[PDB]
Amino acid sequence: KEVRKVRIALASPEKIRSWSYGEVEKPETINYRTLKPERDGLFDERIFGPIKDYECACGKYKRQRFEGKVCERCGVEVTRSIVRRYRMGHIELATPAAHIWFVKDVPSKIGTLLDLSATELEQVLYFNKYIVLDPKGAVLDGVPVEKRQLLTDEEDARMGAEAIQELLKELDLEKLERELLEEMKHPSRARRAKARKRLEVVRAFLDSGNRPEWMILEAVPVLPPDLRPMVQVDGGRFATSDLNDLYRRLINRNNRLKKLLAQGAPEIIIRNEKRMLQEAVDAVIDNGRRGSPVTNPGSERPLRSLTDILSGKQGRFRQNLLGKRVDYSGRSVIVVGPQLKLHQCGLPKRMALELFKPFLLKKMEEKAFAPNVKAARRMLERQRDIKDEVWDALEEVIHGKVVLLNRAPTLHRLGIQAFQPVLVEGQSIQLHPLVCEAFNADFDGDQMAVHVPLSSFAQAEARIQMLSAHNLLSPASGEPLAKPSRDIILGLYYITQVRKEKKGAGMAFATPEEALAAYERGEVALNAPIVVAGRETSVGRLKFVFANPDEALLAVAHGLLDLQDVVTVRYLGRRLETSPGRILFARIVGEAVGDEKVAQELIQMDVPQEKNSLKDLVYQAFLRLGMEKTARLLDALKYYGFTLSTTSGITIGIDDAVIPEEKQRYLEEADRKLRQIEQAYEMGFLTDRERYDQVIQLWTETTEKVTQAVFKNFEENYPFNPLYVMAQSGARGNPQQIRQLCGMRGLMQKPSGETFEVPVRSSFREGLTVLEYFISSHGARKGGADTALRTADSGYLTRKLVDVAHEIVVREADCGTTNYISVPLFQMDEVTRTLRLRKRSDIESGLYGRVLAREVEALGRRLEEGRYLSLEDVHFLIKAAEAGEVREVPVRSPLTCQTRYGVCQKCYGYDLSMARPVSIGEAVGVVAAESIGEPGTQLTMRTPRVIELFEARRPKAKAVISEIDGVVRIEEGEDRLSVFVESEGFSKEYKLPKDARLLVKDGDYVEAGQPLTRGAIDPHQLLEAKGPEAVERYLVDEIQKVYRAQGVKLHDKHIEIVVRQMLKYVEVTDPGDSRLLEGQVLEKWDVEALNERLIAVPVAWKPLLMGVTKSALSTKSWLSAASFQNTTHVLTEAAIAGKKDELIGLKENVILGRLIPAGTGSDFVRFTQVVDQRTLKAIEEAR
């Protein structure tokens, strides 16, 4: 058959024995002082007691057995457990117990009235005074009160923890009561709960089988996992296991009990013992109380009791769910260097081999090499320098096929890609540049694993999606990625930058003079004039739209023109001004696609330079071209992409860092200004804190000036020459990193939160005054802490993300839903209490490729309702916008689309990455959270604000909201700067302490009451004072705000395909049928349950907002989940109710070794295809 819905839950003690089947009880001799194995009691091989001479009867056939002594054809030698399960029976019959009954008050606590001591009896010390028989001191009832001796005042009724096992087959039929009976306790308010949770309690059981068989009478531990034995080398051996010595605790007790009672052990003793079992049971289970250290007394380690390990987090569960292991894996160092780039990959002859060893043999079969594979490995032995023709074969395992390539760490699916292969020499693996960026991890000699998918249905299920030349061009987040990052730029950048060395501005009369003459001295590639031209003359260099302007390249070919933008007159489509220092550009990028014709348009030549407009060109080539070229092209800026930077170079010299000879002047100045500034406070005017802000605010500003300077001396005096320049404009290098270099850089601040008197005595071409390279250090190291915190805190934020979002897939395409959501277009800037126009990016990555809402009339061209707004179009509105016919463009994203079944097609703007709207199937769920796959490092735990909200945590202070709206109300007073609101109906007291003192004379629904101008308070009250209205937003833009001050090339889709979650949940409100007046049920189900059922009664829900983590936990299933804080707790209310746990849930499948319903596995694609006409014309006559 084939797996499906995964059931679980209880298995009443009656069941224990079922699996238990038999085997157990007795003692657990962990071996003999002699022949190590067996013991005839514990991990004893089922029916193996030295020479049982039996048991082999149960087995039908297969092979012989029964060898009298020693051992027969049993499992002990082979098939011993076979890693399979083997249940033990436990002899357990003693009093009671408790399978932990968790830490949420279930399987007891609730189902009575009990807790805070529901264990005052269960853990023998009180009594659940069951038994009806006229009490005395004030009636009896049926619940704990036998404070010992009292249950001796009568001298049923028992302290014994068997009472839970008592009212068991008892308050079971009364379950048809609790169902009835209880809930009937309606209204009054407050107390409205309990019974609520109580409902499920009963409601989990009932027509959902099971029993309160939570009382225990037969723990059931296996044996396999332990019988591990002697480990040598280096410096120690001897060998043993845990869970067993942990197990023992039990049986011994449960054994000593019986024989220590039968011999009449009156009262006191009895309980004090028995209970041992109880405690002894909280063993194999969860060590959560006082502990049970080994080495007893032993003040040490924790017994691996399913806590911190096995089931826990990061021990077994968090380990074997994803922390698995390939088997053809491996690793290696890191290289780079022109090859064929893309689809190509380093990989070292030998190193490789093995990965392919299998087939290797195979090909060697029929085709020479060797005969039977038998040998094969027999030839791969002790590095018998194979080489000979073999190598000439491995490339038949290689050839065409491909492999992967990962990185440590990984915060981007880019993180793998995978390249086809080839092979140079020596160890260490090479890789093509760009990809480098897709790892933002320099070449500090790092390594990278190179797994290798083997299954044919995995390869195609790779390269054509994995090939580094596919999901690396324009990537998720927004912009592109497979661009020539550093270096390559300079290599070309150089081949551009006009050059105007300025020599003069004489004059001419059309070449006779000046032109001719001047070529003796004075003037050159300057301004000049003959009637309307400068000095782009002398060399005509012409041609036609053929295959060579000829001259140009051929002109410089000799000791003539300077390839670097010297300026001659070109000829291609028509009289070109440009120099070969740019025409070449085209040609190459031209030769890529064909007929420079196209290049022309696309490219920008009237401002070459190149830097941040390269992303573009490629990025634009895309839309208009399509991968199969992007490669060739993006893969040309490779060859030449280097040679230029090569046959040109551009070193660096202590010198090169040019001190701005217009410096020592600026400096001097300020100080002076300071001089008095100080010889001012020093007199009698302005408190210290005053001049403080001053002295700083003097260089705080003097700086920028010094900054300004250098960034020009360069761009006039020594344009490109100062290589320390074109490395910051755009190519590889920051700006406030040069002024640091040459300038001065000296604002420098203290440790905690104040700024230093003096600044840095730069002239970094000269030393520093100790204190300098000191206070500098002060600030310097703090960077360090921020970087390691982010990388180490990422452990809390990315995992939760990845989680809360998960099932988000997209089968089908056309759930045509209503309520559109217009993307904001103009934001109130609180610097300008008017309206700016947004950086024109948030828009971009906030509308870049989307699925329009309702018509787009404006500027003459009409954009039909429901259309994928191409980048080309955002402009069409972006630039357009101005006019004023659109201030809120419409479209639909995840802020609506009632289908938690996935996310459906065309609802996720375009599809970011591949030029096209969401392909079908795509498990955006991934990319989703994997969107925040370039944040971490880049941020600041060190306050962290990217979650204060993300988890709906009522922030720090928040500066509380404005409940509703209406009447101003500005009541002045003593020390309570409390301003309020009202309007003939009602309101309250809004106290704004000795903090914000900003008024207002109007109303406003919830604005902010004006204290926290930034980030509304806890939406936990906004949704309340509004609804998902403005609670599926705020954050949405309130978030980005933590990215809009740290680059970030994402928005739109991604971060908005997460929210949906956080609120989806609901808190039922007075319905009928599916019960749970309180409840918390899932979204979409409610719909269905307020649909199919609609055809009756009501189900009236109520939007509800949680957090994120809380969101991740308790979900549509039970399978996934766990992986968090309350490991047990979820498994608790997991069993009970049959809980079948649907299926569609990837993380699910994965674990359960089932295909992941998505990508190329989900419902949408089971498709077929094979058919070769006469084959399809085979069943076309055979059917």
Please give the residues from 436 up to 455 whose contact with Mg ion meets the rule CB under 5 A. Answer: 444
> Which structure tokens are listed for 337?
């260097």
Site for Zn ion in 790-819 (CB under 5 A): 815
Q: Is residue 220 involved in binding other proteins (CB under 8 A)? A: yes
Q: Which of 1146, 902, 1144 is nearest to 322 (CA)?
A: 1146
- To Zn ion, the closest distance from the beta carbon of 46 in angstroms equals 13
Question: Cα dihedral sign for 51, 52, 56, 57?
Answer: positive
d(CA 587, CA 609): 17
Distance CA 418, CA 402 (A): 7
From the list 926, 1008, 1039, 1130, which residue makes contact with other proteins (rule: CB under 8 A)? 926
- Tell me: does residue 315 bind other proteins (CB under 8 A): no
Q: Of 138-146, 197-205, 260-268, 313-321, which segment contacts other proteins by CB under 8 A?
A: 313-321
Is 71 one of the annotated binding-site residues? Answer: yes
Instruction: Rule CB under 5 A: say whether 897 interacts with Zn ion.
Output: yes
**CA gap 603, 593 in Å, rounded:** 13
Q: Which part of the chain contacts other proteins (CB under 8 A), choosing from 158-166, 482-490, 541-549, 592-600?
A: 482-490
Q: Is 411 in the site for Zn ion (CB under 5 A)?
A: no
Which tokens sit at 281? 């049971």
Is residue 504 involved in binding other proteins (CB under 8 A)?
A: no
Answer yes or no whether residue 781 interacts with other proteins by CB under 8 A. Answer: yes
Q: Is 904 annotated as a binding residue?
A: yes
Q: Rounded distance, CA 297 to CA 92, Å?
A: 27
Q: What's the 3-state SS for 128-158?
A: CCCCCCCCCCCCCCCCCCCCCCHHHCCCCCC
868 backbone dihedrals φ, ψ, rounded to 5°: -80, 100
* Maximal CA-CA distance, the chain: 136
Give whichever of 451 and 838 is closer to other proteins, judged by the CB atom. Answer: 451
The window from 198-206, 595-603, 696-704, 720-728 that contacts other proteins (CB under 8 A) reads 720-728
Q: What are phi and psi of 852, to 5 degrees?
A: -20, 145
Interface with other proteins includes 723 (CB under 8 A)? Answer: yes
Question: Is 742 known as a binding-site position?
Answer: no
DSSP string across 566-590: ----B-SSS-B---HHHHHHHHHHH
Residue 929 or 1008 having the CB closest to other proteins: 929
Q: Using the rule CB under 8 A, which residue among 646, 817, 983, 1046 binds other proteins?
A: 646
- Minimum CB separation of residue 786 from Mg ion in Å reads 17
Handedness of CA 570, 572, 578, 582 (dihedral sign): negative
Determine if 498 is a binding residue for other proteins (CB under 8 A).
no
DSSP character for 972?
Answer: -
Q: Does 427 bind other proteins (CB under 8 A)?
A: yes
Torsion on CA atoms 1035, 1038, 1040, 1041, rounded to nearest 10: -160
> Rounded to the nearest whole angstrom, what is the least distance from the CB of residue 732 to other proteins in the complex?
5
Q: Which one of Mg ion, Zn ion, other proteins, none interacts with residue 687, CB within 5 to 8 A by kind? A: none
Q: Is 282 annotated as a binding residue?
A: no
Distance (Å, rounded) from C-alpha 1038 to C-alpha 1014? 8
- Taking CB under 8 A as the criterion, which residues in 1068-1097 touch other proteins? none
Which of 1159, 1174, 1164, 1171 has its CA nearest to residue 457?
A: 1159
Could you say which of Mg ion, Zn ion, other proteins, none residue 904 binds, taking C-beta under 5 to 8 angstroms by partner kind?
Zn ion
Which residues 6+ apart lie within 8 Å of 401 measured at CB?
420, 421, 459
Closest CA to 671 of 754, 759, 776: 759
Of the pair 30, 572, the CB lying nearest other proteins is at: 30
For Mg ion, the closer of residues 653 and 784 by Cβ is 784
Q: Which sign does the torsion angle of CA 390, 392, 396, 398 carry?
A: positive
**Crossing angle for the helix pair 664-681 and 688-713, to the nearest 10 degrees:** 170
Interface with other proteins includes 370 (CB under 8 A)? no
Instruction: Give me the least distance between CB of 1130 and other proteins, in Å please.
Output: 13
**Count of other CB atoms within 10 angstroms of residue 1121:** 22
Interacting partner of 460 out of Zn ion, other proteins, Mg ion, none (Cβ under 5 to 8 A depending on kind): other proteins
Is 345 among the annotated ligand-binding positions? no
Any idea what the Cα angle at residue 942 is, between residues 938 and 946, rounded to 5°? 60
Task: Tell whether the torsion through CA atoms of 519, 520, 525 and 527 is positive or negative.
Answer: negative
Stretch that binds Zn ion, among 184-192, 432-440, 615-623, 905-913 (CB under 5 A): 905-913
156 appears as a binding residue in the annotation: no
Site for other proteins in 62-101 (CB under 8 A): 77-78, 83-87, 99
1016 is a site residue for Zn ion (CB under 5 A): no
Identify the CA nearest to 962 among candidates 985, 937, 989: 989
Q: Is 413 in the site for other proteins (CB under 8 A)?
A: yes
- Binding to Zn ion by CB under 5 A, coded x per residue (else -) over 67-106, reads -----x----------------------------------
Cis preceding-peptide flag for 894 (omega within 30 of 0):
no
155 forms part of the interface with Mg ion (CB under 5 A): no
Q: Looking at 388, 520, 1070, 1172, which residue binds other proteins (CB under 8 A)?
A: 1172
Rounded Cα gap, residues 605 and 576, in angstroms: 11
Question: Applying CB under 8 A, which of residues 152, 600, 612, 721 lies at the interface with other proteins?
Answer: 721
Which residue in 451, 541, 663, 958 binds other proteins (CB under 8 A)?
Answer: 451
- Residue closest to Mg ion (Cβ): 444
Least distance between other proteins and beta carbon 391 (Å): 10
Residue 907 sits in the site that holds Zn ion (CB under 5 A):
yes
Interface residue with other proteins among 359, 826, 868, 876 (CB under 8 A) is 359
Minimum Å distance from CB 446 to Mg ion? 7
**Which distant-in-sequence residues (6+ apart) come within 8 Å of 48 by Cβ?**
38, 55, 71, 74, 76
Instruction: Please report, as a single letter, which amino acid is at residue 683.
Output: M
Rounded distance between C-alpha atoms, residue 949 and residue 131, angstroms: 54
Query: In terms of CB distance, is 509 or 773 closer to other proteins?
Result: 773
Least gap, CB of 445 to Mg ion (angstroms):
8
Both tokens of residue 366? 């029929």
| Residue 897 contacts which entry, Zn ion, Mg ion, other proteins, none (Cβ below 5-8 A, type-dependent) | Zn ion
Closer to Zn ion by Cβ: residue 815 or 821: 815
Other CB atoms within a 10 A radius of the CB of residue 993 amount to 12
Q: Does 743 bind other proteins (CB under 8 A)?
A: no
d(CA 751, CA 449): 41
| Binder of other proteins out of 757, 984, 1002, 1092 (CB under 8 A) | 757
Binding site membership for Zn(2+): which residues? 56, 58, 71, 74, 815, 897, 904, 907
Q: Return binding residues for Mg(2+).
A: 442, 444, 446
Q: In the complex, which residues of this chain contact Mg ion (CB under 5 A)?
A: 444
Binding region for Zn ion (CB under 5 A): 53, 72, 815, 897, 904, 907
